[PDB]
Amino acid sequence: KRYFPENLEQNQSAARLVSAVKARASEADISSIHLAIAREVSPMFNVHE
Amino acid sequence: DKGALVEADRVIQRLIPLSSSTYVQRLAAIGALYPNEFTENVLDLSRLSTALLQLSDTYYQHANDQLRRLYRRMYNDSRTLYMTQRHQELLLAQITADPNILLYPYTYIFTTIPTSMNYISNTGQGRIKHSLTVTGATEHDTVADIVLGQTGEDVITISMVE
Amino acid sequence: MLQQPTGGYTTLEQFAFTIRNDGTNATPTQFLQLLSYEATENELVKKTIPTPETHLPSARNVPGNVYIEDAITQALFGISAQNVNAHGYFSRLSALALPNTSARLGLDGVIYNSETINIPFYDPAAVANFAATYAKLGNASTPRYRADMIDIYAHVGLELAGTDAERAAGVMPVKRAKFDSWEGSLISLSRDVVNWKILAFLIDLCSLEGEALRAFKTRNRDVFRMMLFIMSTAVAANVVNRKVTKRVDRVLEYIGVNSMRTAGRTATITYDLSRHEFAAKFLQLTFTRWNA
Amino acid sequence: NIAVAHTDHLSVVYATMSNFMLNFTNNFSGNHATFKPDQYVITSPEGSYKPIIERQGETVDGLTIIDTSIVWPILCQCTYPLVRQSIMEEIVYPDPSTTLSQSLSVAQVLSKLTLPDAFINMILSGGDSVVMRTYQTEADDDLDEGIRMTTYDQYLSHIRERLHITNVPDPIYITGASTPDQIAASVQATHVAVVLYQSGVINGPASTYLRENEVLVVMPDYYDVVSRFANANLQMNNNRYHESVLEIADIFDQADFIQTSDAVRQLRALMPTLSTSQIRHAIERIAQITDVDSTDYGKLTLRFLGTLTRSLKMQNAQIRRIRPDGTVLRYDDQIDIEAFRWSRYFLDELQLRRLSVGLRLITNPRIARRFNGVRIMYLTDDDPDPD
Amino acid sequence: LAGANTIIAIMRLFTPQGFLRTDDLAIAANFPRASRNPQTYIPYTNQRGTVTNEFASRFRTIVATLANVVNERAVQDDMQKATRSCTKQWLRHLETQFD
């Protein structure tokens, strides 16, 4: 992972930020990612939420 | 200018910005234009700078284009000491009297003094009671309505009956 | 000894002053035609140049033959010259100042302590008139004799940028010089000028009198102006290029204003503080001689 | 007891160290109420500025955490040579050569360190480019011909910060009351053929000026571009234009800012399209080629500095003060030092001087032995000549 | 909107950086297509310049805006003041990663 700049993750005053990003940053998976790309072009029939 | 004898140490009592912020440059620019009308009133020194800054901001804001460019010239040549011809005649006098004397070398003599309107500048206490004249030199044509902002009761209360 | 002609030494083809330009050896005057100006709101007013000090710095007891022309040109025009007053060899001109000295100023620009065979040299009288003023380059750095390095540049501008009317007035708008340019133009101009045998120019400037001197001052005004141009580029606050429809216009702002910059730049030669002191002194002396 | 040791001995140690080569910043004016450090940053028009001073979370092996308690040993349990009671220990005056030489070792390690990146950036210094529609305003205009223009967002992305670096007044807004002369004064004030559009409609002579002089109008948008001009020819049309790249080198031409040698121009013309990773690969390669083992002190310093990540985008980077408010100030004579006005690509003077000669070599015809194009033709080869 | 310019300005960070391609190859192939003028928004065009990438530059302006947004954010707690300063660094990192 390359979520943070050098030193910032181990930084103690960065902790709330690091927790926020980590709360957002899901692990990479080929399937979810390919899906995210593919559904940009795929027709939608049930409205997305 | 009033012709009085003066015992002051130097003919010009203004400072020269050898190296300065932009605001100092504009202050020095407006200081050689002598905008102020003569006044005998007491002034509040504590806010003087602000006054002189605001004055400057207005002076350039409504001067004729040549006076504007002149102000800009002074503003850019802040190292130069601008002065009226009579000032320089005084300097020539004191040099011929004491040849060894050291005067600031980089000076520019005004061949003609600027014709700008004198500014009233009483920064002391008390409201002005203007008596608006019916007519003047300026001609107006379809001037826009000037909305007056609401004022707090802290500034001015309006009782019904004097 | 090369005898000085009725005109200056500069009348001789041996001392042609030319800058390389458009693939040819252009005369400086026909380069200055390329120059053009953009007045700014700001003004230059020329003040009287203070009279140079009577004191000629003592030539030190120097065994060697000082290369004076090289020192002077490199101080005024050199791309890489620095600390020009530390070595202090300009004082050597004063050796030539004496009547009946054994010293000779060679056409090489060297200052021989004795006349020496197969080295042509300028007539000692003319050189004496020259040294009697230019030895004072030897005290360009001594504090009592330092030239103003700010006001003097007005004259530079006036003699360079100035129209005949602006020159008669003694005041001109601060202008901004510009010319269509090849790559590295100002550097090449400065090197073409550093190669000049300017001692011929200064010697003729100091030795000539009356009609000869006046004819010299007109015939050579553009040479002087080229030296002024190199010098001014050395003190110009900035030197930009401008696109102009598949042509590039070099632009130096501003003429006649010494910005006192000492940081180097690729575009042009740079004056260290010492180079400023030297150029200031040079301009004081040379402008003094130029007006009489 | 210790007072004489401090005021009369340690004070001189401070006075010396303040003069050491690498002690380059001003640390404190002595007045707590008002003092703040000057805050320089390296500033790319491209990437983000990087402040020299920030809370970047680098403890430097715990050096940034300050134990005040240290004052106790300094008072209550340390000896000083001036405080004898009296042994009269002789004062030590340390050899300059040691600190001086290590300072020099650091400096030389640093310049040698930045060199390959500075070189590639010098080459690509003109290479950033804005998108540029060129509307045609004449019957027989070539695609290159016309009125050049660009979106205001491009102007912000590229042109404006560079104008701030060049320290020139912002280009005039044009209102259709504008004379070609006013346009000219603007361009000659900013040294860049750029004006910002404001209100309609631009008049005939002004438009002919912008066309003949290749001035680049900066429209807020391309919503109805032809409405903005009074095109008497009616040759202009919203559908008639050529979108095309415009290199910054083809706008700006400052000598120590944007390398615009035709040598470098054609050399870049030879380059394949480049991503940032490509450029980084180039720098790393050059560094790999020209790395030379340092004096042992220098190896210790590079070891101490940690991995050379170099996230900072060094293209066209300058050194500028920022306001504590966060805005980047224009370079100011009367406050910033002359060295800071132009980075000169972060190359040494002599390197630039040599670079010019090198450019003369690189464009020499004799060197140019990469050939383009072949003619396939079936022919007998009697009396061959290469030419 | 007259008094909510910062909101509108932040909202402009969301405008797409692509272009609306016509689905030409499908129309040539007579592929089924419900619109009478088939189209499709490609998120981003390929880089036409030799060095500048318009996508990355756009993200630079976005992160710059967000950074000055964070910088201008008043905070009460000291820890918030810290996270405010760190968020700007993280933003700077995001910008390089994107580029």
Side-chain angles (χ1 to χ4, degrees), chain D residues 236-256:
Chain D
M236 203 169 182
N237 172 246
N238 306 270
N239 299 120
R240 190 199 185 190
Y241 61 86
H242 189 229
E243 206 173 27
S244 61
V245 129
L246 213 225
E247 305 174 0
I248 253 70
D250 300 330
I251 305 173
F252 299 90
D253 204 334
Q254 274 270 32
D256 284 299

Side-chain angles (χ1 to χ4, degrees), chain A residues 6-8 11 13, chain D residues 55-58 309:
Chain A
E6 155 236 354
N7 292 322
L8 175 142
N11 192 350
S13 68
Chain D
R55 290 213 75 189
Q56 39 217 339
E58 181 57 52
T309 52

Side-chain angles (χ1 to χ4, degrees), chain C residues 2-15:
Chain C
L2 212 201
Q3 294 188 4
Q4 194 180 27
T6 303
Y9 274 115
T10 54
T11 75
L12 305 179
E13 61 184 357
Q14 177 185 13
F15 309 111

Side-chain angles (χ1 to χ4, degrees), chain A residues 4-49:
Chain A
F4 305 112
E6 155 236 354
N7 292 322
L8 175 142
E9 191 183 358
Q10 302 182 350
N11 192 350
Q12 189 60 35
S13 68
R16 182 73 179 270
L17 165 69
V18 169
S19 87
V21 178
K22 270 186 163 63
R24 296 316 309 168
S26 44
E27 187 176 358
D29 299 270
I30 18 85
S31 62
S32 45
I33 279 172
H34 289 171
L35 166 65
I37 297 174
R39 80 182 143 204
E40 213 278 349
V41 251
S42 297
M44 185 203 48
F45 300 125
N46 195 96
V47 161
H48 293 161
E49 286 178 0

